[PDB]
């Protein structure tokens, strides 16, 4: 009946939201340190093909990993200008969105929550409208409803209650009145109206809506309307479900060609095309049949598996085992970590350096 | 009076914070975007140095080169080590907290404002208790008041209203139903009780808290009470969530952002590297580092580093490589990508030498 | 997902002007050299722009009647095309080269929109 306190075929799909927006901070913390790792993986693999061409130097092995060294710094540039131009504001927007959006469901589900009489009547009702409800462990009548945001450790992003289309459990409610409403509880939060709603001397002046615009309390004894928020579109009085529905949308994680290796051959490589014809051929506009004359020279072939081949000569070639720890290995494939990697290529670079001057002095 | 609506002594406190709380998200895109800038500039001055390097072999200034280049990218590498593992964390928990916070907040003063009957009564009032307030623009009754998390930009944020110790304006209420409330106005969400309050056929069973916490409408004909959070340590916890979260930002202004003026020896990967690669040995006296820097700077001082780089910044590269009446030198040249695929030239270079010398 | 969303197609009368554009979204723009092709036959490239901007290229059937630009303040790419003849009738379609040199040749392209139809009339 319209003007009574709400059974849980109401409240739970906004603890089922509420529950999920807990987890956008944590999904954009994994997002920033995943798209970093790679960032970091691709700057190992150019470390790794450096040392390898510092080591075997004048050789067309060592000409062959230049272009791989080439490819992974380039891929590794590219990451971090995608994670600062275009990852960074993704995953703060969808974070805040999410929060802020959070925040307003809780704030009301709070009140609802808090608004009771007895254990029979309040504004928050279980499933059959018996009693009310309490919250104990991070559930309200057994439904996950903390209400407060959680502590953030990194999790990776998923989607069950706000998807690509929109919050799939806030459907359009043809009967709110016996659906939503009670028949016995009373609730004054359910109605504008004074007699059993929020007015003291008169009805409130107009409809008044509660979760970021979710529901309309009308000022009249008659049923609450909500938004049917499962088939959105870019546009509201309930905006900030728009925006998290959006920014949550938006989100590519880091996926996106910078941060993914390539399985397309070695012409159409990122950098390499470009290096062959700029340091080899040193002409400007080069026909597809001269870069793979020259593939050929340096890794045999223009297929993957060509520079499939050449990796695994780079991951195999050992280092000085005075430049790693006792007992540690040596082979640049079993080395990981950009600074580790960084001081060796160092060491390699002043050989070069030495070995240079002792040839042509 | 107890169980009135609200004057603005209560609420302008409220919109203070949310309206600075809204500036947190604009923050953490700030620092986000300026520690991969700084590791970004880092990087261009290791391609530089290396590109120097590669050029000038042959020389002890080449050498030099070689050091400068793996000090940058020891610092371009910790930079985003940082980003990685704790300014991304920084600024996600600031954001979260404080978008969460303001959220409770502006749920709360949205129902206050629509919670009223007439032009003269309701739930938000003016300072003196005469109006209803209204929303205009993004104020609420001339109070700076949006309600609603703005589109993201890079800014920094205010700490006017949150700071380090607490909540500035959140101080302890010497009289609240003089100060909170007005004498007139009717806000059923004043009090828990049923004549005047939230209360159906009787009270509310306990005293309802509102706004994450910070104000308790008890169940009995009597003014609220707030909590006095202007003063914090570590039944509000967002509160003090958004607070501490805010405070421990350190911005990209660690260590592995910033640029070292002291000397060469005690410059990042600087002794070690002398040790590993030109004295070969585990442990070393710093004269013997001294020794080894004055051959290849010409000195152990600030000033002899920034000679180095001056060289590095002046020497020109290939035109080819920069295309027609375009800049040369390196020190006109910027941007990761663009600084790598130079760099991979001189290296095919290197390679065409020793393919002979060898 | 990222996308490349063209824009600006229609049916034209045969002699004047058309202006299409591409959008990218959830892409860093200034990271790929963008290029247009068309679909009828086989798809074929009409014209692109190095990842840089330095440099343009156009298919030798369009040169001097068409020309791109890309405006990275607005994350779009634009085909200008002029002395439209029956022959442009095609589906045109907009692609993304990460770093790439703005050519067809070795190029592959990561990302691709689904295309605007360009009618010509005579």
């Known amino acids: 009946a319209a003007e009574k306190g709400f059974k849980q075929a109401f409240w739970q799909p906004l603890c089922q939201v509420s529950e999920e927006l807990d987890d956008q901070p944590k999904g954009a913390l994994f997002t920033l340190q995943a798209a970093a790792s790679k960032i970091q993986k691709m700057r190992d693999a150019a470390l790794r093909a450096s040392i390898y061409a510092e080591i075997n130097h004048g050789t067309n092995r060592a000409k062959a990993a230049v272009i791989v060294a080439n490819h992974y710094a380039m891929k590794a540039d590219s990451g971090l200008e995608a994670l600062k131009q275009t990852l960074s504001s993704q995953e703060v927007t969808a974070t805040a969105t999410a929060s802020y959006l959070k925040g307003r469901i809780d704030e009301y589900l709070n009140l609802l929550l808090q608004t009771k009489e007895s254990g029979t009547s309040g504004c928050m009702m279980d499933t059959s409208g018996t009693n009310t409800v309490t919250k104990a462990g991070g559930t309200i009548g057994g439904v996950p409803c903390k209400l407060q945001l959680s502590p953030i450790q990194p999790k990776r992003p998923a989607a069950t209650y706000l998807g690509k289309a929109g919050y799939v459990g806030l459907t359009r409610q043809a009967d709110a009145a016996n659906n939503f409403h009670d028949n016995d509880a009373e609730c004054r939060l359910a109605s504008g109206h004074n007699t059993n709603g929020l007015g003291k001397s008169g009805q409130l002046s107009a409809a008044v809506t509660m979760a970021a615009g979710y529901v309309t309390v009308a000022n009249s004894q008659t049923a609450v309307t909500v938004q049917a928020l499962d088939a959105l579109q870019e546009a509201a009085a309930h905006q900030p479900w728009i925006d998290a529905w959006k920014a949550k949308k938006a989100l590519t994680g880091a996926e996106t060609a910078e941060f993914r290796n390539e399985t397309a051959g070695i012409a159409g490589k990122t950098g390499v095309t470009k290096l062959v014809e700029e340091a080899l051929l040193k002409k400007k506009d080069s026909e597809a049949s001269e870069i793979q004359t020259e593939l050929k020279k340096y890794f045999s072939g223009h297929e993957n598996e060509q520079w499939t081949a050449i990796e695994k000569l780079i991951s195999e070639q050992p280092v000085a085992q005075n430049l790693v720890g006792d007992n540690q290995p040596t082979k640049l494939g079993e080395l990981e970590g950009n600074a580790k990697l960084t001081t060796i290529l160092a060491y390699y670079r002043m050989e070069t350096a030495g070995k240079f001057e002792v040839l042509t002095q | 009076a107890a169980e009135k609506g609200f004057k603005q002594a209560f609420w302008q406190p409220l919109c203070q914070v949310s309206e600075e709380l809204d500036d947190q998200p604009k923050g953490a895109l700030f620092t986000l975007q300026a520690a991969a800038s700084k590791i970004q500039k880092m990087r261009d001055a290791a391609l530089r140095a290396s590109i120097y390097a590669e050029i000038n072999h042959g020389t002890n200034r080449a050498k030099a080169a070689v050091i400068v280049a793996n000090h940058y990218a020891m610092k371009a590498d910790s930079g985003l080590e940082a980003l990685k593992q704790t300014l991304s964390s920084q600024e996600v928990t600031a954001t979260a907290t404080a978008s969460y916070l303001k959220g409770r907040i502006d749920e709360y003063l949205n129902l206050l404002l629509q919670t009223k009957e007439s032009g003269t009564s309701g739930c938000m009032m003016d300072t003196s208790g005469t109006n209803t307030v209204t929303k205009a623009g993004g104020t609420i009754g001339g109070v700076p008041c949006k309600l609603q998390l703005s589109p993201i930009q890079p800014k920094r944020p205010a700490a006017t209203y949150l700071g380090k110790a607490g909540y500035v304006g959140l101080t302890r209420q010497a009289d609240a139903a003089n100060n909170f409330h007005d004498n007139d106005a009717e806000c059923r969400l004043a009090s828990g009780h049923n004549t005047n309050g939230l209360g159906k056929s009787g009270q509310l069973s306990a005293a309802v808290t509102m706004a994450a916490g910070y104000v308790t409408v008890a169940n009995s004909q009597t003014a609220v009470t707030v909590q006095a959070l202007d003063a914090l340590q570590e039944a509000h916890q967002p509160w003090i969530d958004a607070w501490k979260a805010k405070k421990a930002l350190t911005g990209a202004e660690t260590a592995e952002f910033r640029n070292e003026t002291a000397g060469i020896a005690g410059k990042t990967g600087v002794t070690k590297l002398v040790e590993e690669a030109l004295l070969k040995k585990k442990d070393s006296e710093a004269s013997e580092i001294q020794t080894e820097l004055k051959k290849y700077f010409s000195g152990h001082e600030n000033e002899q580093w920034t000679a180095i780089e001056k060289l590095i910044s002046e020497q020109p590269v290939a035109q080819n490589l920069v295309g027609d009446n375009q800049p040369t030198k390196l020190g006109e040249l910027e941007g990761n990508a663009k600084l790598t695929t130079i760099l991979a030239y001189y290296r095919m270079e290197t390679a065409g030498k020793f393919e002979v010398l060898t | 997902q990222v996308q490349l969303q063209e824009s600006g197609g229609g049916l034209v009368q045969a002699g004047g002007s058309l202006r299409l554009s591409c959008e990218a979204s959830g892409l860093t723009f200034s990271n790929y050299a963008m290029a247009w092709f068309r679909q009828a036959k086989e798809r074929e490239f009409v014209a692109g722009?190095?990842?840089?901007?330095?440099?343009?290229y156009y298919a030798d059937s369009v040169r001097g009647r068409f020309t791109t630009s890309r405006d990275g303040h607005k994350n779009t790419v634009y085909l200008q095309m002029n002395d439209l003849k029956p022959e442009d009738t095609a589906v045109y379609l907009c692609?993304?080269?990460?770093?790439?040199?703005?050519?067809?040749?070795?190029?592959?392209?990561?990302?691709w929109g689904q295309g605007t139809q360009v009618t010509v009339s005579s």
């Open positions: 722009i190095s990842w840089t901007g330095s440099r343009t």
């Open positions: 692609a993304a080269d990460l770093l790439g040199s703005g050519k067809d040749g070795t190029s592959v392209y990561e990302y």
